[PDB]
Amino acid sequence: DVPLPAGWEMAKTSSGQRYFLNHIDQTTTWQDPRKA
């Protein structure tokens, strides 16, 4: 289950946007946690 971080939300926008929320910090992430 680690390949998909647990405090991270999968905001999959059909427009072609994959942004990840850290629902712990309320951090707006445009970088894939495995890409960084």
């Binding site: 939300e9 905001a11 926008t13 946007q17 942004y19 707006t28 445009w30």
Partner: peptide, 9 residues
Amino acid sequence: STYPHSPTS
């Protein structure tokens, strides 16, 4: 469980 919004609009 609240959907936010895309960080840039």
